[PDB]
Amino acid sequence: PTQRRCGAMEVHHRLLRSASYVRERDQIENLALKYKQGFRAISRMEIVKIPVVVHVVWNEEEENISDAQIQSQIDILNKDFRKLNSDVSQVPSVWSNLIADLGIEFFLATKDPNGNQTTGITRTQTSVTFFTTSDEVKFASSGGEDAWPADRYLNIWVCHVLKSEIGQDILGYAQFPGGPAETDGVVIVDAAFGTTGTALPPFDKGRTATHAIGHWLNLYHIWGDELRFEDPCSRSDEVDDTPNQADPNFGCPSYPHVSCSNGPNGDMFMNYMDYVDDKCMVMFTQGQATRVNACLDGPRSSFLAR
Ligand SMILES: [Ca+2]
Ligand SMILES: [Zn+2]
């Protein structure tokens, strides 16, 4: 009974408290709001390629993932984000003209933050076995490689065991943009990372990382969130073109799944921000991309200028 469980929202409550994150998060949403209404939409017509470093923390070598495994994930992302995935053909025709190309690929930096030529994969032996939504795997003191600077690279943590504060075993999380630097990255368990090696289905397509990436582009789950105290229909992903559902669908669904009306269009289970299996989450919406655009210009302005 392995269910998809994303702790990124569990991070989000705990993010609020220092209020340093609160200042940035308000500024971050006004851009993503003003972009939403249409106000300013000067669009870049060049895709941006983004440097990425993977931190493997292995308690055992079997946990330590092969490099070939790491690449299979890297490739599948660059297929997913430019409308290149073979899976895009599974979207119902109702939304064929709504599928989007984020206009984004990424790479494993030739250079580490100090300048020397680097692979892009740090491997750290750790004595710990479990890891939490406490983000303790990110920091060095807790058996997890120090995060590389947030403006130069996008940090990655891959470990064997990921758990929630509730205890329910998670596949990964993500820290929202404008967040404090040393956590400004995403973590995915080793069995959801890539298309081979220790990667296992229904996370062998590696879309599990794709999903928690979207939180790094400031994408809410389609349903709003369960962090949010509300009647389930009044929590929304602030994306107009995705049908506002309230219940995540896991596994693979039968078209259509009707949540908070939106019938007969049904839920957008094909969206990577739903909890479906990897082979059924295939695409990103035009609205979502527009939200990504707003995350890139103001919060992440560093990466565009490279
Ligand atoms: Ca929506
Ligand atoms: Zn998530």
The DSSP annotation for the chain comes to -----BTHHHHHHHHHTTSHHHHHHHHHHHHHHHHHHTS-----SS-EEEEEEEEEEESSTTTSPPHHHHHHHHHHHHHHTTT--GGGGGS-GGGTTTB----EEEEE-SB-TTSSB--SEEEEE-S-----TT-TTTSGGGSSPPPPPTTT-EEEEEES--B-SS-PBPSEEE--TT--GGG-EEEEEGGGSSSSTT--TTSTT-HHHHHHHHTTTT---TT--SSS-S-GGG---S-TTS---SS---B-PPS---SSS-TTT---TTBTTS-B-TTT--B-BHHHHHHHHHHHHTTSHHHHT-
Of 299, 300, 306, residue with least CA distance to 26: 299
Contact by Cβ (8 Å): 28, 299:
yes
DSSP assignment of 8-21 equals HHHHHHHHHTTSHH
Q: How many CB atoms lie within 10 A of CB 44?
A: 11
Instruction: List the Cα angle 71/11/272 in 5-degree steps.
Output: 45
Residue 269, C-beta contacts closer than 8 angstroms, at least 6 positions apart: 249, 252, 253, 255, 257, 276, 280, 281
Ligand nearest to the CA of 217: 2
Contact by Cβ (8 Å): 222, 274:
yes
* Phi, psi values for residue 200, rounded to 5°: -135, 150
Q: How many CB atoms lie within 10 A of CB 165?
A: 11
Structural domain contains residue 293 = yes
Structural domain contains residue 305 = no
* Gap between the Cα atoms of 175 and 216, Å rounded: 6
Of 189, 149, 144, 194, residue with least CA distance to 169: 189
Whole-number Å distance, alpha carbon 221 to ligand 2 midpoint, is 6
User: Environment class of residue 306 by beta-carbon count within 10 Å: exposed (0-12), middle (13-18) or buried (19+)?
Assistant: exposed
Distances in Å between the alpha carbon of 196 and those of 71, 145, 204? Answer: 9, 23, 7
Structural domain contains residue 138 = yes
Contact by Cβ (8 Å): 58, 158:
no
* Phi, psi values for residue 88, rounded to 5°: -60, -25
Whole-number Å distance, alpha carbon 116 to ligand 2 midpoint, is 34
Peptide bond before 256: cis, by omega within 30 degrees of 0?
A: yes
Contact by Cβ (8 Å): 5, 173:
no
Only one residue has tokens 């709001």, namely 33
* Gap between the Cα atoms of 159 and 124, Å rounded: 10
Whole-number Å distance, alpha carbon 3 to ligand 1 midpoint, is 23
Ligand nearest to the CA of 186: 2
Whole-number Å distance, alpha carbon 215 to ligand 2 midpoint, is 7
Distances in Å between the alpha carbon of 156 and those of 108, 122, 270, 292? Answer: 11, 10, 25, 19
Ligand nearest to the CA of 171: 2
Whole-number Å distance, alpha carbon 243 to ligand 1 midpoint, is 5
- Strands 104-108 and 48-58, how do they pair? parallel
Counting every residue written for the chain, the total comes to 306
Structural domain contains residue 3 = no
Whole-number Å distance, alpha carbon 288 to ligand 2 midpoint, is 14
Whole-number Å distance, alpha carbon 33 to ligand 1 midpoint, is 13
Whole-number Å distance, alpha carbon 256 to ligand 1 midpoint, is 16
Structural domain contains residue 243 = yes
Whole-number Å distance, alpha carbon 19 to ligand 2 midpoint, is 22
Of 221, 143, 225, 213, residue with least CA distance to 184: 213
Whole-number Å distance, alpha carbon 240 to ligand 1 midpoint, is 5
Ligand nearest to the CA of 260: 1
Q: Note down the domain range covering 292.
A: 8-300
Whole-number Å distance, alpha carbon 113 to ligand 2 midpoint, is 28
Whole-number Å distance, alpha carbon 202 to ligand 1 midpoint, is 25
Side-chain-side CA neighbours of residue 152 (13 Å): 14
How many domains are there within the chain?
1
Whole-number Å distance, alpha carbon 67 to ligand 2 midpoint, is 25
Resolution in Å equals 4.5
User: Environment class of residue 4 by beta-carbon count within 10 Å: exposed (0-12), middle (13-18) or buried (19+)?
Assistant: buried
Q: What is the CATH number of the domain that holds 18?
A: 3.40.390.10
Structural domain contains residue 1 = no
Structural domain contains residue 79 = yes
* Token reading at 45: 């017509």
Ligand nearest to the CA of 274: 2
Only one residue has tokens 């493997």, namely 56
Whole-number Å distance, alpha carbon 270 to ligand 2 midpoint, is 14
Structural domain contains residue 66 = yes
